[PDB]
Design a protein around this motif. Structure first.
Motif, PDB file in Angstrom:
ATOM      1  N   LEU D  12       0.969  -1.217  -0.100  1.00 32.71           N
ATOM      2  CA  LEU D  12      -0.090   0.082   0.098  1.00 32.71           C
ATOM      3  C   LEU D  12       0.938   1.393   0.063  1.00 32.71           C
ATOM      4  N   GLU D  13       2.148   1.315   0.583  1.00 34.50           N
ATOM      5  CA  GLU D  13       2.808   2.503   0.519  1.00 34.50           C
ATOM      6  C   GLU D  13       3.409   2.753  -0.975  1.00 34.50           C
ATOM      7  N   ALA D  16      -0.914   2.794  -3.700  1.00 35.39           N
ATOM      8  CA  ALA D  16      -2.141   2.630  -2.534  1.00 35.39           C
ATOM      9  C   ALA D  16      -3.417   2.331  -3.075  1.00 35.39           C
ATOM     10  N   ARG D  17      -3.248   2.398  -4.527  1.00 38.97           N
ATOM     11  CA  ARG D  17      -4.448   1.855  -5.311  1.00 38.97           C
ATOM     12  C   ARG D  17      -4.011   0.297  -5.855  1.00 38.97           C
ATOM     13  N   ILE D  47      -2.991   2.578   9.288  1.00 38.48           N
ATOM     14  CA  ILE D  47      -3.189   3.583   7.812  1.00 38.48           C
ATOM     15  C   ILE D  47      -3.964   4.717   8.573  1.00 38.48           C
ATOM     16  N   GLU D  48      -3.003   6.013   8.594  1.00 34.93           N
ATOM     17  CA  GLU D  48      -4.033   7.070   9.025  1.00 34.93           C
ATOM     18  C   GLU D  48      -4.465   8.174   7.840  1.00 34.93           C
ATOM     19  N   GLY D  49      -3.889   7.812   6.479  1.00 29.87           N
ATOM     20  CA  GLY D  49      -4.755   8.385   5.709  1.00 29.87           C
ATOM     21  C   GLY D  49      -3.984   7.973   4.193  1.00 29.87           C
ATOM     22  N   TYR D  50      -4.655   8.406   3.020  1.00 29.43           N
ATOM     23  CA  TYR D  50      -4.548   8.138   1.697  1.00 29.43           C
ATOM     24  C   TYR D  50      -3.939   9.489   1.050  1.00 29.43           C
ATOM     25  N   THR D  51      -2.672   9.561   0.760  1.00 26.41           N
ATOM     26  CA  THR D  51      -2.383  10.813   0.092  1.00 26.41           C
ATOM     27  C   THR D  51      -1.551  10.619  -1.254  1.00 26.41           C
ATOM     28  N   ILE D  52      -0.949  11.798  -1.817  1.00 28.25           N
ATOM     29  CA  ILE D  52      -0.103  11.439  -3.036  1.00 28.25           C
ATOM     30  C   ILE D  52       1.446  11.758  -2.847  1.00 28.25           C
TER      31      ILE D  52
END
Lengths: 140, 140, 140, 140, 140, 140, 140, 140
Positions: D12-13, D16-17, D47-52
């Motif tokens: 996921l790192e 993430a998709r 997982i504290e959050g999804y980012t770019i």
């Protein structure tokens, strides 16, 4: 820990012979309790042991020195145990400060410091820099 | 001091409850002597006092930190006594190392360290630089 | 690029699964302007990838460390490469600062940090010095 | 936690998709073990959050700088807060290193860097010193 | 000792051939109190010797340098001894500062200083680093 | 100048009351070549003065300290001048090293050193920082 | 040098094609004189040579870097000549600052700096530390 | 730039009077071209101007000093222009090294350096630290 146990460690750390009975009257609780508490702190490990606070000036140790010990990265722990072994390293730490090793050494004079540094610490396989910082006065 | 008194302080510093009687059999001398000796070291001041060695990890104090405290030259002693006053400065020195003040502080975590630094030590009139160095491990 | 990109970029670093429609109503622009925008961003390498912000604290890593790594000048690119191989090295830089190699290390505790330095970083061949600065709080 | 988490976390790192099915066939586990796993990870704050992952180089930021920020000890928390307000400050730490405030700054070029330091950081009240180390390459 | 000693000492460091009679009338004391005083000073090693204040500037030494000398910890006493053998080393210390070996070097000019460092100090075996600080003016 | 001067100079720094006749037989030159030589040396300012080598150790000064003194740039020449006024400052330099003002201080002990720094140097107006390096042994 | 020759070097250093004739009218003296002067400065060596001031940003050299080069004391001059030999060392000094070598290098980017450091300067037999300091802007 | 233009700048930087005609025969191209090229470099700005390389030892400037100038962050540019204004600051940079300002000053001697530092640079409103590093020798 509890507040009571905090007070009990404060007190004991000021005079570790304060008799249980005195703690108890200090806290309003009882001997048995002060007993029980004390033991429990001891069994836990909060009280590692009963010791003595010894004065370096009166033993003639006029230069209590905080010594840095740099090391080849690879020989950190090997240096550390041989510094552990000398009786003038009165306490040894690994640190995140400038030098990983950090010895609180007691030499008796500049020439004793200079001797220790070079003849004892300076000759440990692996040691790449001794950085001694002399304590002018202890305040607490 | 005499060799006998050196041994007696070694021993006591390892367990300051070792009973006189045990010292005496350790040295081949007698109780009364071990007594006499001990008292004399105490009266002299070589034995400042009877205390306890307390474990910071088990009290939850995970960042035992050697903190430097820079100061305006003129306010060295004024800072030093207010650092003396806080209960998290477990021992305070004047040094010839990078920072004159040198506190051995116990915070419980990065945010506790960061809090203490800035809200307590950082706000002492006169303090011009806090330099905290966290102890990774105690070796002696 | 343009303002809506910077904003889209802002939004996406915040919540990368932000609906294009909410991006959209916020910028006041079609979902399909958004969508197009996101993908030239993606196309040009501005968005280089989607990943997850992971919290070390909840994963047992209570010690986020910025470790400068000094090295024999011959071997700066070897030591970097042996360092990136390891899982504790979360991000790794070649920097102009006081140390050419800069790593963001996650160790569990002081001990763990002591251990990674001495046993895993330190023994990498060519490492002349490890310099850990423990982070107290992360603010952005 | 457990190994498949660490792997799921690794995957996921990276992307993430990443489909749960590809995660799934890789771990050799149902999409729905995956799915469940991802969401306790999400639940517990791991997982504290999804980012770019955004590339500064393609955005005109050719100078990724690690700026230590020294400060009047009174004002460490004020200066941090005026610093996080700014968009050039990409990440901001309170660290135990040589400087309490550590920021990752993105400036366009030397000039831009000169400018941010002098005009935007520097004028923040309480800033006693800016210390920029320019990053040469990012390796992980 | 006593005040007249400190004064006699003051006078004698100033002009060592100061007549005892002028010392005498100044302190308001016999030539023979003086004479006696000078010689217990001499006796006790307080006056350890008579020498000449020599000016480097007039001797072609326009570069009075304080050179710290870093060294392999094994070899601190070897390098000191190879250093004292040389005539440019005017005074030589084992100090607690940033460098254990501290020398006061007299070189003619930059070039000469460059030369002593590289060819004479530098090649001493065990010298890991030379650190020259050029003195601008001497004020006492 | 010439070799016999350098030798005469050598001899005279060693024992300044060395007979001219012993200088003489050593160089193998008349007492009156010597005498003439000594006095052009004296004339030209090469010998700038006769003084006494004084031992701090026997005078109660067990702490010979090299104190760098940092200062507000405005006030470097004021602070030097307030520093030379004091008797503990034995020699005083304006140096290119890490600190512009460099003094050789003689304090009795750590405490005394702590005291001079804080009460006498420190309060001089303009002193931004005192940096003491204690000397361990003097070797030449 | 004379005042006239000082002015003439000021002028020439601003545009070393200023025709003699223009200097002469600048000074109130005559061509022949301005001629004579110029030649004499040249023959003397005050004018080492006629050169060009070349702009690194417009040649694409975006990181003009002041690089420190530490060295084993013994190999100072051997390193120095091999740094002399590389075409990116646009000027080389021996210094009394932190690093003896001191190169003004022109790299074109972080990865060029990082490349040069490690592949070219970092691999010179003897080099023990490269310390690059990037020029944000040139002001004079 | 082209290879030809690179050679042409090499050549001119070695003697900026080399006549076009000599460049042309050096390159195998022709005068007109060497002409055209030169002008084009000039019009572009790669050739900022035609100057002179002047020897400080022969002008009596024996201490060419690389001076650091620390500053209150807020007054960086105000200091910089007043340092710009002094005629002994022969070139001024903003840096990412230890001190933002970085002057290449020419003093004639220690007392001139010490004078300049304190009376001229030390008195610029805003200057918080001058750090002079004397060039022992220029090598390229």
């Amino acid at each position: 820990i509890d507040e009571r146990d905090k007070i009990i460690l404060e007190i004991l750390e000021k005079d570790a012979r304060t008799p249980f009975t005195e703690i108890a009257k200090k806290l309003g609780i009882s001997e048995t309790a002060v007993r029980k508490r004390v033991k429990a702190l001891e069994e836990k490990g909060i009280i590692e042991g009963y010791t003595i606070k010894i004065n370096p000036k009166k033993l003639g140790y006029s230069l209590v020195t905080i010594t840095g010990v740099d090391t080849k990265p690879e020989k950190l722990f090997e240096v550390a145990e041989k510094l552990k072994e000398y009786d003038f390293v009165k306490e040894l730490y690994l640190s995140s400060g400038d030098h990983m090793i950090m010895a609180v050494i007691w030499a008796k004079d500049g020439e004793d410091l200079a001797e220790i540094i070079s003849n004892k610490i300076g000759k440990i396989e692996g040691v790449t820099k001794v950085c001694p910082a002399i304590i002018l006065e202890k305040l607490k």
